[PDB]
């Protein structure tokens, strides 16, 4: 939607620095996860136990369809969030 997007933005800008996903990339991945049935809300990313199925599903789609466009964004989020939850 909006609020959660900016939250993710400022978050990754602190963990990944300048090498963070652009807002235009964040929204794209967000909408994909919803239509894929992987997620249902923008706050779903706050669930660590739901990361595994997503990474698996995206990896499958990437290696089968031949495109890691959505996987790249996920990897960036996963890395930053994993580090955040590590503290
Ligand atoms: O303020 P930053 O540390 O430079 O991060 C920005 C902000 O999060 C911005 O939201 P806002 O315009 O509300 O500050 C967003 O739109 C940008 O993504 P993009 O470059 O594709 O336009 C992003 O880099």
Curated annotation (Swiss-Prot):
Compartment list: Virion
Disulfide bonds, paired cysteine numbers: none
Protein name stated in the entry: Matrix protein p19
Source organism of the structure: Rous sarcoma virus subgroup C (strain Prague) (RSV-Pr-C)
Shown part of the complete sequence: 1 to 87 of 1603
């Amino acid at each position: 939607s909006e609020a959660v997007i900016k939250v993710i933005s400022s978050a990754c800008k602190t963990y990944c620095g300048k090498t963070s996903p652009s807002k235009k990339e964040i929204g794209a991945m967000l909408s994909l996860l919803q239509k894929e049935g992987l997620l249902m809300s923008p706050s779903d990313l706050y669930s660590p136990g739901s990361w595994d199925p997503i990474t698996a599903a995206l990896s499958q789609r990437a290696m089968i369809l031949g495109k890691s466009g959505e996987l790249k964004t996920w990897g960036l989020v996963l890395g930053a969030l994993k580090a955040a939850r590590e503290e």
